[PDB]
Amino acid sequence: AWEKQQRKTFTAWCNSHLRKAGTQIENIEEDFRNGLKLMLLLEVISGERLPRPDKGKMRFHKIANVNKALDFIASKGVKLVSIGAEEIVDGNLKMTLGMIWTIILRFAIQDISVEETSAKEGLLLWCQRKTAPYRNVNVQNFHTSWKDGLALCALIHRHRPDLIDYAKLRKDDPIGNLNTAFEVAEKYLDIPKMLDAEDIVNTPKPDEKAIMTYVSCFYHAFAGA
Numbered sequence: 001a002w003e004k005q006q007r008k009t010f011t012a013w014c015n016s017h018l019r020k021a022g023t024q025i026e027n028i029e030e031d032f033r034n035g036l037k038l039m040l041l042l043e044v045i046s047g048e049r050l051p052r053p054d055k056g057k058m059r060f061h062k063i064a065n066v067n068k069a070l071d072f073i074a075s076k077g078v079k080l081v082s083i084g085a086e087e088i089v090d091g092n093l094k095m096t097l098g099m100i101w102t103i104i105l106r107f108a109i110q111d112i113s114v115e116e117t118s119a120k121e122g123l124l125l126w127c128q129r130k131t132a133p134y135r136n137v138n139v140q141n142f143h144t145s146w147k148d149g150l151a152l153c154a155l156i157h158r159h160r161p162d163l164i165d166y167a168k169l170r171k172d173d174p175i176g177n178l179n180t181a182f183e184v185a186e187k188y189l190d191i192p193k194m195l196d197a198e199d200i201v202n203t204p205k206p207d208e209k210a211i212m213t214y215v216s217c218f219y220h221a222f223a224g225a
Contacts, residue, residue, distance in 0.1 A: 002207045003093065005199055009210035010100045012194035013108075016217070017044045028100070029093040035065025038088075042072055045107045062089045070099075078106050101209050108216045120212065123219055127151070130158045136171055142208035142215070147200055149177025155215075156184055159222050163188055174201045191217045 011028045018024055021040050025031035032038040034057075039050050051068045054061035066085040074080055080102070087095045105119075114122040114129070124142065131137045134154040139145045146152060148171050157166045163184050169177050178197040185191040194214040200206050 001199075001203050003097065005196070005203070005207040005210045006097045006101070007093070008196055008199075009194045009207075009213050010097060010104070012192050013104060013213050013217075014041055014100065016192045016194075017041055020044050029091060029096050032066075032096060033089050033091065034062045035067075035069055035089070038069045039065060039072075042069055042103070045103070046072075046076075059089065073103060073106065076106055078102055101213075104209075104213050104216070108220070109212060112216070112219060123212065123216060126219060127155060127215065130155050133158070134166070142211045143206050144204075146211055146215075147206065148174040149179075149181055149197075149200075152181040152215075152218075153177055155218055156181055156189075159225075160188070185218070189218070189221050191221055 007028055011025060014028070015024045018037060018041060021044050023037060023040065025037055036053055039053055042048075043050050050072050053068070054064045063085045066088045070080060070083065070085060083095055083099050083102075088099060109123055110119050112119060112122045112126070114126045117125045120142070124139065127139045131139050131151055131154045134150070134157075137151045137154045139151050150169060150171060153164055153166060153169055157164045164180065169180070171177075175197045178195070178200060182193045182195065182197070186193050191214075194217070195210065
């Protein structure tokens, strides 16, 4: 169950950035094998220029491109473990998802700082501060606390009360609450849908890496304004 959620969410997150470079991926376990869109993804999110990609379709050129991507990530303090270019190139879903998570964590979550609290813990505190006024919400983690959709709706309502009629939302309509939040974020906040409502409501403990990935988009979207 963790793999399905991470595949959907990580793919959508990558696409939310790749669109700025005029491209997209579809199958995360295949579309980064030659390293080209992986290098592009890193340039988009970092605002920096990576080395030029290799010229050639041979397997060793793909390995070289993936190594350029991995070396860049490592230069940002990321300690790559077990992740090898050969595996990314030949195909390994688990390793690929692990690599993309390290990227999401380093570039979208690690530098978040709220009240002397950083990264994951800081993002959580931010969510707690924003949803404090809502009695039917209780953010205590990045999994079960988000299952009924009220926390996400509240997070949006706190910044944009004009976008959601919070009083109409009921805890017994989790799918509806989640979709309402997903739709509003997509249409008005330019945050692509990254979570599947059914998976969130039916999985006892939803994947927190996927939820953190999606929620981090709201932090950055609201941090600007």
